[PDB]
């Protein structure tokens, strides 16, 4: 178009304009403090407004990217502040959007995010509304940089709901304070979801991306033919495309293109859709996003006939490898609603395999014969997997629980620093308070998309910060296979284990006046470091050198002088815990 | 240019015979780097003894300390052991307790 | 108070040590090590114990990585057999408010020549090998971005999040514990020396009284531990048989009053 920023502002209206760019500022800039940002949007909106009431006004055919570049280096080349994005801004479009984009910070270096007293929120609200909640945007948008944008807006508009209604409540805590905190954990779930899907797209490129989406919708929408499902993965694709590569004008615009295609299509589509359509632009976009599985068409024919008897398998598959495997994935796919979406790319991908070997037989047909023998083992695998760690869980509690994989992860990754193994045994720990509660037939695929979405945090900030190379070759090798990849690794014997040295041993009192959870997190660097003297340890020689850690804790917390006996009682813990180990 | 290695034979805490101790090797203001450090008990060098990171001082000089847990005695006779490039001989200093 | 690290490479090392190491420091206590065998940047002493973030000692490991191989590529500008060595003192001291104020200064086989010209961007110096090297470096894509980041970004936040979190480790106070020992000398005089053992922070003085009046300094020497608390001494030559009109007075920052040592 002969102005992108008046096209954009016209499709999408000022006031989802103007969030999404504040979402793009700060997803650029995620150090840039929020009065900055909302300086920035406003004039970037000034200058929209102008190229609507006269499209040929100076520079309105610049490109998004120019514009949103020339607004972030104003503030952006202050290297003291800003850090490696100070050399974006020492380059020309298109290398300098290019530069920002390899610069989101996955692990950003930001304050938690403390909650105010309720009547402070609710005063806050009443004041000023429109800044109260575009702090919510920035504050969330800086945290998760790749968070889904057109999602973020319907968040922001949960967010402002929770606030309309509750700060008038008899008691507006509890009204409130609910709310709030299952927005927070949606929020989350949410940017943990794109972040893979991102990854997909720019790691393992597109089909990956369309073959999670194929699977996902064909669950979805499975009364509509493979050619619709094509069509609507097209667009999605495109959307993802967009929105993971910062495009999030453009991304936003072309996801209501495809809400409303889908809306004016249900008879093609699904019979969940009526009421999901009705609703304003946000509102139904993120219905259709969560709307409930359509039935499934009755009496349906075995995908043998299809996919195992037919003579034409190794041609149809030669011609159009990614298309026929779309149509296995969307058969399988639909008939199985309750399967994750991983276990079911795991599926495709190993009927894939097997076509790629049986088709150059001298007899295919005999070769991949029994195919689909090969699926009730790995459909089990993660099922008793989730089932003995749910057992664990329950009789550990979630404390022993993180604890039991704090081990199993430093033992895996000696490499990492014991900060790093605390938060992926925590975050890895957490599937089993999400999942285990659930019944039998949802614990599965709930504990196999939540581990890959954590697998694959875990992977975003190793490529950028490399420890082990084995990580990298589970983070890179199969983005499907990365679950068994991590599961399969034993104690990493590549690694020199850290030697004990009483005289370079140093604790001091200051763990006394910590927290119970705070402490606790001592306790778990004191088992990091254990691992790390002896990554071959068993369970019985680390209980032992914990007991002796805990037992030192409380001899010297209540001790009279604290810091002479943290002092003097250490050269002997130093010697306990070697002894504990068989040294 | 080339600097000779400074020697100072310590221990961490004040010397008690029978009470445990570490015994310290602190070698200072020498380059180049490459130094070889030994402590002593009655003449024979110690076997597993420990060392901190080669580090260096505002004027460049690289430093070291040595040590090993010990219980000094009556009897028993400590010292330290090193060698050098701008050393003719390796050079011994002796544990003078409290000195 | 500043974070300093301490670099060294070494063409030709023993068979066995790392060619590339490094200790960080925050004031007078070594929080970091680093070694091109073992790789990882790791914590020292107390500082394994600190409230840290997930990736501060993985992005500390990666930027050390990438300093050992400029390091080396040092020697390859320089060319030829030496055997050489190259240092680095790298770092920042916390200024006036929310400023810092960068070092960046090289040494070559014991002599400084190089530093790194925070305005330019450039590695400079006078001699031949300060241009050779400091010329290489500037080819290599990004060497001189990663190096104006490390010191004007990534430093003062480290040491600002040390500081926060840190604190304890670095407000650490041991008094030292003192001994006053007499010696025979040479024919006709003793040695007195005055010890101090384990002591932090670094900061001490060491005093001889004879009869309480001023009796001087002496000679001494200073050291640390293992753990980085601190060993002192200073000595004074008395004659034979006067030893005990002599005594020893000690101040430091962990004494509530200066302690004055006797003769054992």
Known sequence: HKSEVAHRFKDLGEENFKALVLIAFAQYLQQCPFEDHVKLVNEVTEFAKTCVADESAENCDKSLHTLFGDKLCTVATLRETYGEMADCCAKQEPERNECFLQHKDDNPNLPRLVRPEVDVMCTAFHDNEETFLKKYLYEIARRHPYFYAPELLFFAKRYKAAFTECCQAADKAACLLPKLDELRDEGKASSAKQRLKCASLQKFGERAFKAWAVARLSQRFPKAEFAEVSKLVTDLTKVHTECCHGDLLECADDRADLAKYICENQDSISSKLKECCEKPLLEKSHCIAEVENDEMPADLPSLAADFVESKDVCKNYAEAKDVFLGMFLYEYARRHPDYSVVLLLRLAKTYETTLEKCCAAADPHECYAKVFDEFKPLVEEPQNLIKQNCELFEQLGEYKFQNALLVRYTKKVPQMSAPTLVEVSRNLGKVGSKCCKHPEAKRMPCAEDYLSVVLNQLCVLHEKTPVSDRVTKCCTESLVNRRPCFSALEVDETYVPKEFNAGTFTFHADICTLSEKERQIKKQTALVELVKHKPKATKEQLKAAMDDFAAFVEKCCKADDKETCFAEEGKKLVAASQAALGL | IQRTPKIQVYSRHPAENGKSNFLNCYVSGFHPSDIEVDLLKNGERIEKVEHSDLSFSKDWSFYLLYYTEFTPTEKDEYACRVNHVTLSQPKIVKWDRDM | ?264
């Open chain 3, 1 to 264: 108070l500043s974070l300093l690290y301490h670099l060294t490479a070494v063409s030709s090392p023993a068979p066995g040590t790392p060619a590339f190491w490094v200790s960080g420091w925050l004031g007078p206590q070594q929080y970091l090590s680093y070694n091109s065998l073992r790789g990882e940047a790791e914590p020292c002493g107390a500082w394994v114990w600190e409230n840290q973030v997930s990736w501060y000692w993985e992005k500390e490991t990666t930027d050390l990585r990438i300093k050992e191989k400029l390091f080396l590529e040092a020697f390859k500008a320089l060319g030829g057999k030496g055997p050489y060595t190259l240092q680095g003192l790298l770092g920042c001291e916390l200024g006036p408010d929310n400023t810092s104020v960068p070092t960046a200064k090289f040494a070559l086989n014991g002599e400084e020549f190089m530093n790194f010209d925070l305005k330019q961007g450039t590695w400079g110096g006078d001699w031949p090998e300060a241009l050779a090297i400091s010329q290489r470096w500037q080819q290599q894509d990004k060497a001189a971005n990663k190096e104006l980041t490390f010191l004007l970004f990534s430093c003062p936040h480290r040491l600002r999040e040390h500081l926060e979190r840190g604190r304890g480790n670095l407000e650490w106070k041991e008094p030292p514990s003192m001994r006053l020992k007499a010696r025979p000398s040479s024919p006709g005089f003793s040695v007195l020396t005055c010890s101090a053992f384990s002591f932090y922070p670094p900061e001490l003085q060491l005093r001889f009284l004879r009869n309480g009046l001023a009796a001087g300094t002496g000679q001494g020497d200073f050291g640390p531990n293992s753990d980085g608390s601190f060993h002192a001494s200073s000595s004074l030559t008395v004659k034979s048989g006067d030893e005990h009109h002599y005594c020893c007075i000690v101040q430091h920052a962990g004494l509530a009053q200066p302690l004055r040592v006797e003769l054992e």
